[PDB]
Every structure is written in C-alpha cells, then in structure tokens.
Amino acid sequence: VLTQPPSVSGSLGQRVSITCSGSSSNIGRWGVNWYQQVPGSGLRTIIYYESSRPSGVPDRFSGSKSGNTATLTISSLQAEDEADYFCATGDYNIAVFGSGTTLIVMGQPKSPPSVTLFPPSTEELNGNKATLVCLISDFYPGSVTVVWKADGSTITRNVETTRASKQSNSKYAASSYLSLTSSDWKSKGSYSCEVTHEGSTVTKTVKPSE
Amino acid sequence: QVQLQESGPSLVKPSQTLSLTCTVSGFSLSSYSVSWVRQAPGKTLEWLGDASNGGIIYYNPALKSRLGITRDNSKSQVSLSLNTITPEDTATYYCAKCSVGDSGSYACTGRKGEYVDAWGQGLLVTVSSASTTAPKVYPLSSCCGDKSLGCLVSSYMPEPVTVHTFPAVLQSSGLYSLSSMCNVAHPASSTKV
C-alpha cells in the first residue's frame, strides 16, 4: 500500500498538494495515476502517468514525481475540489493504491443548524411504535452533539445519530432518531431534541397533544 | 457515449458466493481491457483483477483462491465470482474501462496513455444474514402549532435507497432508516413509493 497523508487542508484559492510515497518497484518503476472521489459518489481519473489530464479535467490539477514519491498539486483550490484522492500504480505482480487523502476546504464562516423535529404518525402508534425524527441542516464545522430530553431528563435509550455529513453547500448535516414504543411517547409530556453547535443550543419540541 | 453497468445481488449471506456482472456499451471488449476493483466502507481501493482485450485474466494473488473472472466479448460482459465470503467482502464493487487493450502494469496503469477512462457507478454488495426488507414509509410534518415536509423511509435492508436527503442510520434493530427534505426507491426490495 502506498502512503498518502490522511488529510490535506487549504482555503479557497490556495496552492495545496498531496503526496504518495512508495518504492522503486512501484512509483519508482511505473507512472502514477490519481482518482478523485466526491463523498457518496463514484470515481474519476484526473491525472495519469506523470501530468496528463483526461478530457474535462481542468488545468488547475497537475502531477509530478520525484524518486519514489508522486505529488498531486491543485494550483488554486476551488470548492468543488473538496473530495478524497487516491494514487494508483503497479507493483511486481499486483496493482497498488494509496491509502487515500481527504482534501479539506478550510476558512469558511459558521452557519446555524436548521432543526425540523417531527413526531411520528397515527400508523406508527397503531402498530405501537414511535419514531422521533430530528433533522439538522446547514452548519460549519461538523461536530454537533444531540442530547434528547423527556420532560427535561437525559436519554440514551435507543438513540442513533448519523455523524457530520456534507450535502453540496460546503456545510454539514446530520439526522437523529428516537426509536421508542407507543406508551413511551404517550407517557411523557414533552420530548426535545437539544442540538449543540460551538456553544449554541437550538432546542425544538413537539408534545403528544398533537 | 461509454457506459459500464455493474449488476448482481446486493445482499449475499456469509459463506455463499458473491457474483457480479459488468455489461459494457459504447466500446468493444476486443479493444480495451476491463478491471474490477472494490472499496470497503470508509476504506481505500482493492484490486480484484483485470481482463485484457486478448482474453488474458490477471488476478490479485491475495484473493485468487476465491476469485474467478470471465470475459465474453460477444455479450460485452465481464463477470466476477467470489466464493466463501465474509463481512470483510462487504464493499462497493466497481468495474472500469482501460484506455488500452492491455496496460504495462495492473488495473490499467504503467506506461504513457494508460488510465481508466471510464468508471462504473459501483454496486454496493452487503454480506449479511439479515433478510431483505422493504421499508415502511410515512410522511413527516410538524402540525402542532407554531409562528412559522419530509419522508420517513424506515426499517429497510439493505442499503442503499434513493430519494436534502440524509444518509441512513443503523439502528439497534439491525435495519436502516433515513429521511429527506415524496419518491423513495429501494432497488434491493424491488419496491417503489
């Protein structure tokens, strides 16, 4: 396996580069290719051999090789470059890949988390089960913490929360669920989804009266 | 244009055989090599094997005892079978079109002009004993008084599902659930809503 830095950071417009370290039997012997992978999507080849660009790949992307290390450079970082990057070549009898680098775009301003907390439905309670859905949208950075309350008391019973995601606006999103029974939702008077974000709580609450 | 489509069961039980087919179009397998690679969740890429335009099959020696790859130019298909699977074989499986009939190295690398010029979309195959479950979907509204819609595709298996949609969560029930900011589509369950 070729070694790549786990992450590289830069702000918009900066020059950033990503290295790929191997040996004389791979990077030292063969050309080196690079693949771009946007989170959730597939793969795209952006550089091959030395610094060749497939059609459609802008000239901001370039590559070079020095000894047993290959370097992928973005001369001016843009927002659509936030993705993972993998180097690729061959060894004696196998294909080898780099361990991958997440390219992080830093220097962004903060945004408040939009929380539309929803109660379950009449079909769910007729099948005696309650699914509280706490959706969180548009915040930077992505390190929010959600604490559920039942009339003002901590809850860790049946709490699953997707970690910080990334849609398409250079921000982060997350969803949290409360998979409790029918009586458990009808018992208490009010449940709340308390979301923390850099020292800011945006609590929402619907009570079973409606 | 050029297109590569991965097909096969996306949920296989451990110890069974995982089989996939890549059907290609827009180009002839007599002209270009085709590679299979996979990416386990949150991990890097792993090479499975290559199938050159001359019928030569190159394997990852770490997987050769379980791996078989076949190439049918007449049907424009390159297939893979992987037996004796375990959850370590859960991955997104990609086929890929090489720019040449046979590259100097493996997985379409090596010499000048040799690169993957078209990637498949990938097919996530989950290795698990769970049963294929079509999701129970409901609407999500907040009609409880305010001074001011989402979907509830819950309890399905396996991933993925297609619909601001959120990534799914793995509840303790062993099933997946997600929501969106309604048309949901679970290809493994064959159901549409």
Residue numbers in the entry:
A (entry chain L): 3 to 212
B (entry chain H): 1 to 148, 154 to 168, 180 to 197, 212 to 223
Question: What wording appears in the published article?
Answer:
We have investigated the role of the LC in the structure and activity of two neutralizing cattle antibodies (B4 and B13) that bind the F protein of bovine respiratory syncytial virus (bRSV). The F protein epitopes recognised by mAbs B4 and B13 are conserved in both human (h) and bovine (b) RSV, and are a major cause of lower respiratory tract infections in young children and calves, respectively. Both B4 and B13 are potent neutralizing, fusion-inhibiting antibodies and protect mice against hRSV infection and calves against bRSV infection. B4 recognises antigenic site II (residues 255–275), whereas B13 binds to an epitope contained within antigenic site IV, V, VI (residues 417–438). Exchanging the LCs between the Fab fragments produced hybrid Fabs: B13* (B13 HC/B4 LC) and B4* (B4 HC/B13 LC).
The H3s of B4 and B13 are of different lengths, comprising 21 and 25 residues respectively. Both contain a pair of cysteines, at positions cys97-cys100G (B4), and cys95-cys100E (B13) (Kabat numbering) and structures of the Fabs revealed that they form disulphide bridges irrespective of the paired LC. The two loops of B4 H3 are of a similar length with the N-terminal loop contacting the CDR3 of the LC (L3) and the C-terminal loop interacting with CDR1 (L1) and CDR2 (L2). Viewed from the top, the antigen binding regions of the two Fabs show differences in both shape and electrostatic potential. Both Fabs have a negatively charged cavity surrounded by positively charged areas, but the B13 cavity is much bigger and the negatively charged area is broader, consistent with the fact that the two Fabs bind to different epitopes of the bRSV F protein. For B4 a large portion of the CH1 domain of the heavy chain was disordered, including residues 149–153, 169–179, 198–215 and 222−233. The area of the interface between the variable domains of the B4* Fab is lower than that for the B4. This analysis shows that amino acids 100E to 100 L of the HC in the B4* structure have very little involvement in the interface except for Gly100 G, which is completely buried. In the B4 Fab structure, all of these amino acids are involved in the interface with ≥20% of the amino acid buried. This string of amino acids at the interface in the B4 structure contributes four hydrogen bonds, involving Cys100E, Thr100 F, Gly100 G and Glu100 L, which are not present at the B4* interface. The Kdapp obtained for the F protein/B4, B13 and B13* were 84 nM, 125 nM and 234 nM respectively.
